[PDB]
Amino acid sequence: SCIQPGTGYNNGYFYSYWNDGHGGVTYCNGPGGQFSVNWSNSGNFVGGKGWQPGTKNKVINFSGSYNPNGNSYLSVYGWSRNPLIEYYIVENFGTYNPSTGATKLGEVTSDGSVYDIYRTQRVNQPSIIGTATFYQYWSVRRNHRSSGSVNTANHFNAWAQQGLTLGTMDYQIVAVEGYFSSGSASITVS
Structure with missing residues (x-):
């Protein structure tokens, strides 16, 4: 049940x-x-x-184990279109906090922790629509964890309040991301 890159x-x-x-x-x-x-x-x-x-108010439940060795994130991750936005609600990470050096755009309390909100920009980078320049929105959880519940509405509403608007939703997943690292993870979504 191990597969090549793709969707389905x-x-x-x-x-x-x-x-x-x-x-x-x-x-x-x-x-x-x-x-x-x-x-x-x-x-x-x-x-x-x-x-x-x-969806714009999904409550996402996740549980499992997340053991990165190096640069990696565990997040609710997805995209919107029109505007094109890549977004993250980061529950845990490895050696690198993805908000390092980024502009802080607020705070939101949700699901047992404060999160810090940030906006970054990707310039001429791959995206769901091809090479593009687009913003990324981040909520970074202060208290790291690998199980819990994420009320996405609290994040999307806080972002909107701050001027970080989302267009129409594309996919929305609980994602393990790695950048030139090692690790293991086992996650169950519902």
């Missing part, structure tokens, strides 16, 4: 698995909302399960 449906859940071609990643779909990633000296990859399209 498995046991009722959308999945997306993408990598940059470097090697060193094994992504597998399991029963229900379960997926696993095992990686060793990878390149950049993103994989996980959820919904296509996402």
